Amino acid sequence: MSKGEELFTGVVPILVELDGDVNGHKFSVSGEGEGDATYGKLTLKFISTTGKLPVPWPTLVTTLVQCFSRYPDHMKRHDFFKSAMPEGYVQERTIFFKDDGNYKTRAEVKFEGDTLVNRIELKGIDFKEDGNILGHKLEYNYNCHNVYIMADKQKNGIKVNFKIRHNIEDGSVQLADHYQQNTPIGDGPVLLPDNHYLSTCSALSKDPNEKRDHMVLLEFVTAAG
Secondary structure, eight states: OOGGGGGGSSOEEEEEEEEEEETTEEEEEEEEEEEETTTTEEEEEEEETTSSOSSOHHHHTTTOOGGGSBOOGGGGGGOHHHHTTTTOEEEEEEEEETTSOEEEEEEEEEEETTEEEEEEEEEEESOOTTSTTTTTOBOSOOOOEEEEEEEETTTTEEEEEEEEEEEBTTSOEEEEEEEEEEEESSSSOOOOOOSEEEEEEEEEEOOTTOOSSEEEEEEEEEEEO
16 A cells, blocks of 8 residues: 555556667657556557657567566555655666677666656667667567566665667567666665566557657556566
């Protein structure tokens, strides 16, 4: 339980801000939509306020609000994300692209008044000028995964991990090895969870009215374990 989850009993307006620089390539991304922790649902819209994105959209998916996951009633004791609100948390990642570059991200997710805000900073390097990332070899789609979470006492948060399986144009897949940290920005009490994971699905599509380089995202997530 947490006074914090109370803030997600209904639909919640969401905004995303991303500043990234891959292999020196500079890009800005904006997102807006809403969240339904109730149902484990996200409906989001993103575009590049900077032109044709330098990396494939799906490389950005993880980086672009785990607090919207749906935690089963017997799950309540282990929901760090919501518990942290509205003061929010820091979310940092290091992501390894098999036989290619990596991303380092630093984000804060918090309420900004009536909105849940995800503000991120991204850095990519060691990217193969002619790899699937830089030569956009990834097909616009997304697999379902399991986000494994454990407590991080000292940190006072959670240690998170998973590997994304990105579908390659050549019919193969490409591993996106995620290394993740979440810490409470606030000073109030948080739930430190036993081990578990999040059952994550997302679906990528396009908005036929959109000119700018963009992506329409939908996520469903439920806790388990």
